[PDB]
Structure 1
Amino acid sequence: MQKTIVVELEDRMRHPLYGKIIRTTKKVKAHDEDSVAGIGDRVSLMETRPLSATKRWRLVEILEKAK
């Protein structure tokens, strides 16, 4: 993405009626000033101002690099 990265985030929210716990996955665009990230490459993200049209996150640090 030429200084941007796409990061999959997941969360769990209880069903309003049945009450089961379910898992849903999302997708956010994160700013990478120096684009160093591959497939996997767990990253912790903190949300910023609207840096671009569809970017509201920035890179904080790289933890648990890809195996």
Structure 2
Amino acid sequence: MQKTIVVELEDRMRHPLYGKIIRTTKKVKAHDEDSVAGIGDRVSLMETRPLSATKRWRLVEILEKAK
């Protein structure tokens, strides 16, 4: 989808009453000034000003490329 990237975030947090550690994910959008990205691509991101309706993130650096 044309210079847009989707990063699936991760977070773990203490369950409020049963006290377990719940694993909760996200699916969020980040920018690509260059539209090169495979599937996988452990990458990092930081916030920006919105560039679309649900755009809030930007890719900063790509590491351990999709193998």
TM-score by length of 1: 0.94
Distance 1:15 1:25 in 2: 15
Counterpart CA distance in 2 for 1:21 and 1:60 is 29
Runs of 4+ residues deviating >4 angstroms: none
CA shift, 1:52, in A, is 1.2
Identity %: 100
> Gaps spanning 5+ residues in structure 1: where?
none
The CA distance in 2 between the partners of 1:54 and 1:25, in whole Å, is 17
Could you give the per-residue CA deviations for residues 12-37 of structure 1, whole angstroms, max 9, x where no partner exists? 01000000011011011011110111
Unaligned segments of structure 2, at least 5 residues: none
Size of the aligned set, in residue pairs, is 67
